[PDB]
Amino acid sequence: NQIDLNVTCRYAGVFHVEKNGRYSISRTEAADLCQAFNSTLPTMDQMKLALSKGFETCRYGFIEGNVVIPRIHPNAICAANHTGVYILVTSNTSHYDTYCFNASAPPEEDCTSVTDLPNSFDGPVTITIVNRDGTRYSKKGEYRTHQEDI
Template sequence: MASFYVWATFGLCLLKLCLTKTQFNVSCKYRGVFHVEKNGRYSLTRTEAADLCRALNSTLSTLEQLEKAHELGFETCRYGFVVGYIVIPRINPYHLCAANHTGIYKLSANTTGRYDAYCYNATETRDKACEPIERIDTSFLSNQGEIVIDNEDGSRYNADGTRHSGDK
């Protein structure tokens, strides 16, 4: 009987893993550059960050692209990958963000850590655009569960572009 409970518990754990939800939070775009996180803070490797940007019809931002976005007012309090660096774009000093620095604060090149991503969409030429991302190309992602895109404006979409009706 004890082995039944072990297998039942194991089966429920597997079921829970199969039903996991992957959430992507996406910021507004500044000259095509935007911040994206997966399942909360700092869960992406550099390779996963690049794949996620591709899934969002973008590439990993270069430092130069991020600098242009920063000049237009783009700032976060989140470390993220860009090509060759891990950065936080800061305009206003804040003691909990980038050690109170402003500008593009760079960490030493850490290839094994997990961070967020700064993506660049070359087709977005406006200074600031906050239209929601409604669809994600899942062929670039290694995900087994439900995908939900959370946009800065509060809208939520499933990977296929349909409105998500679940709780946030």
């Protein structure tokens, strides 16, 4: 009973989280996941500032109100060669990664590893934070508050 949370560097507080390295987070789960990180879904403005500090991914993830990909460099296989905060317009499906925003983070690029999920609650799941450099932190707990998400 195990969940990997793959996390990125923070840029102006904003970071990307993949559950098990595959699109698999609903909009309700995303809010709960950010909450467990003492974080919120970013606003578009917060995401634009993160972008300006060096944040890009090649993954769809929730922000507050939209599903987006932050892009600095044009890449044909990432948001169809767009740059800026690319907004997903048309999709059949409801599950993506998520972005989160932690106000207490440094103001620019923070590529130190994440070594806690400070606000997870008591639960049965072995949750493992996986950093991009492979550093891991695990704890037993839960973050999902919606039965539909479990």
